[PDB]
């Protein structure tokens, strides 16, 4: 199941400001960039061996 829809967002409401909601950057999240970095690390191992 996804984790990005269950992030506890804090509500920011201040006088004279348009209200909004703030959510943290999820850490240790699996992302296409993370998988690409892992793939490149294995690829570098492969190239070194070859």
Residue 28 as a binder of RNA (CB under 7 A): the answer is no
**Contact with RNA (CB under 7 A) among 1, 13, 46, 48:** 13
Give the residue from 28, 29, 10, 7 showing the smallest Cα distance to 20.
10
Residue 18 as a binder of RNA (CB under 7 A): the answer is yes
- Per the CB < 8 A criterion, the answer to whether 2 and 10 are in contact is no
How far is it, in rounded angstroms, from Cα 42 to Cα 11? 42
Q: What is the closest distance, in whole angstroms, from the C-beta atom of residue 8 to RNA in the complex?
A: 6
**Contact with RNA (CB under 7 A) among 1, 5, 46, 49:** 5
């Amino acid at each position: 199941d996804d984790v990005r829809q269950y992030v506890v967002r804090k509500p920011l409401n201040k006088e004279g400001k348009k209200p909004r909601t703030k959510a943290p950057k999820i850490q240790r999240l699996v992302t296409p960039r993370v998988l690409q970095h892992k793939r490149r690390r294995i690829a570098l191992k492969k190239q070194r061996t070859k």
